[PDB]
A = this chain, B = another copy of it.
Amino acid sequence: MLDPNLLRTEPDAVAEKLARRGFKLDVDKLRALEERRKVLQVQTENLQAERNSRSKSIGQAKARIEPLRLEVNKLGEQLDAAKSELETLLAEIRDIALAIPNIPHDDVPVGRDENDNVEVSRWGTPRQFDFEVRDHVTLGEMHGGLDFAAAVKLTGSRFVVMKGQLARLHRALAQFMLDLHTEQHGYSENYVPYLVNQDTLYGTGQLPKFAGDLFHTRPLEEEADSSNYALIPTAEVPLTNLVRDEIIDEDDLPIKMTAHTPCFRSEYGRDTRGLIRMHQFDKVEMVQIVRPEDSMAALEEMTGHAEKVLQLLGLPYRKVALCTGDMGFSACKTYDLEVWVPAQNTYREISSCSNVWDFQARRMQARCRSKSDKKTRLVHTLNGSGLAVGRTLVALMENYQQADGRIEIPEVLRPYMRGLEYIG
C-alpha cells in the first residue's frame, strides 16, 4: 500500500513513477470515487451525531417516551443504510489502492522486461566439460534419485519424489544454508505455519491481486468462519507478518529472521522438464525488519549473504539489478542472482533480493519508535532467497557431474554428508 496522503497531494507524480513499471493508475476514477466518498462521509457522520443526540434525549426523558423512541429507531434504520452504502464505496476505493504496486526507487534502471535488466557483477568461471553435459533430470534418473513419474502418480505434474542420496543432498543444502545465516550472518531461526489467513496475505501483497497464484484450503467443519487459508508461496509471508500491529523499540532493530520451508505456487510451456518450475519447492528465506534509513545498506548486506552461499558452494553466478518492468509487486529495488546451469548454457535465477521500503509495513501497521519520540514511523522490510533449495540442487548436480554420472559433493557440504566425496 502507498501512502494515502502521497496519492492525495502528488497523484500525477505518483502516476509518472508507476508508468515506469508499465502500471497505469486511473487518477480520474480514483478522484471521482474519493469526491463522492467525502459527500457520503459528511452525510453519515451527521446521521451518527443526530442519532447519538436523540439517544441522549431518551436517557434524560426516561428519568424525568414513545414519540422519541420511534424517532431513534427510524434514524437507526437510515444510519445503518448510509453506513452500508459508504462501506461499499470504501471497499471499491480499497480494491484500487491495494492493487497499486510499489513505487520504484530512483536506483532502479527504467525498462519494460527482463531483457532490460542490468548485470552488476559476475563470480566464478563456468566449467569446461570433456564430455556431453547431462541435465539434472538425466542425472536423477541415472542415480534413481529424482522421480517425476512417481510424483505424478502420488499427486500430479510439477511435483517430485527424491529418493536416497539425492534426497539426503537436498537436505544437506538446506542445513548448510540455515547454519550459515544463523551462525555467521546474524539471522534468528524460525519454525512457521505453512498455512496462513487472509490478513497475512493482504499484509505481504499476495492479496488482492495474486489470489490465483495460490493453493487455497476449504474451511474446516469445526472452524467454519475462521479457517479460509492458503499455503505459503514463500517464508517471507509468515516471517514479515510477525511484526504486524507491533510498535518496535528502534534499539531492537534490525530484526533478522530466517526459515526453511516448502513453498507452494501455481503460476505453461516454459521449463516443462525438471526442478526449475515446481508447485512445491524448499527455500531458505532471509527477512530483515529495519529502520527506514538503513534499508538500502541492508539490501547490499542481504544480497551479499545470498552470494556467500554460491561462493562457498563454488557455483559460478552473475548479479543482476532488475529494471522497473521486471520487478515484483511489493519491491522498490531488487537484485537477482543467476547461477550457471551447464545443460542450459546460461545463467538461471536462484535468488531474488528486495527492499520493500514501507509498502508491507503500511499494510501491516508495523512501526518503530525511539523512547523519546512523540510519534512512531513505519519500519522498512526486506526479503531474499538464501537460497531456493531445489534450484541449488539443479546447479550442484549439473556443475559437479563426473563423466560416469557421479556427483562430486562440494567441499563445504562434505561435513553435512558424513565426509562423503561422491554420490555413486
B-binding residues in A (CB < 8 A): 150-151, 153-157, 159-165, 167-168, 170-171, 175, 178, 182-183, 188-197, 199-200, 212, 215-218, 220-223, 226-227, 229, 231, 238, 241-242, 244-245, 260, 262, 264, 266, 268, 279-280, 282, 418
Contact = CB atoms under 8 A, between A and B. Distances in A.
Contact of A215 (B155, B164, B167, B195): B195
A266 B195 CA distance: 13
A163 B227 CA distance: 24
Given A154-B192, A162-B190, A170-B191, 19 more contacts: A153-B199, A154-B196, A154-B241, A155-B193, A161-B191, A161-B192, A165-B189, A168-B182, A183-B418, A194-B194, A194-B262, A195-B264, A195-B279, A215-B220, A217-B231, A222-B266, A222-B268, A223-B266, A231-B231
Most buried by B among A154, A161, A196, A280: A154
B227 A156 contact: yes
Contact of A162 (B151, B171, B191, B266): B191
Determine how many copies of this chain the complex contains. Answer: 2
Nearest to A194: B262
A32 to B, nearest CB: 32
A223 B245 CA distance: 37
A159 B222 contact: no
Contacts of A171: 178, 189, 191, 260
29 contacts: A150-B242, A153-B245, A154-B192, A154-B193, A154-B200, A154-B241, A155-B196, A155-B200, A155-B229, A156-B227, A159-B193, A159-B195, A160-B191, A160-B193, A161-B190, A161-B238, A162-B191, A164-B189, A164-B190, A165-B189, A167-B188, A167-B190, A167-B191, A168-B189, A195-B264, A195-B279, A215-B229, A217-B218, A220-B266
A154 B165 CA distance: 35
Most buried by B among A157, A188, A195, A241: A195
Contacts of A188: 163-164, 167
Given A153-B244, A156-B227, A218 B221 contact: no
A156 B197 contact: yes
Instruction: Please report whether the interface of chain A is mostly helix, strand, loop or mixed according to DSSP.
Output: mixed
B238 A154 contact: yes
Nearest to A268: B222
B154 A242 contact: yes
A244 to B, nearest CB: 6
Nearest to A267: B222
Contacts of A231: 195, 217, 231
For the complex of A and B, 7 pairs with smallest distance between CB atoms: A162-B191, A159-B193, A155-B193, A167-B189, A220-B266, A167-B191, A215-B217
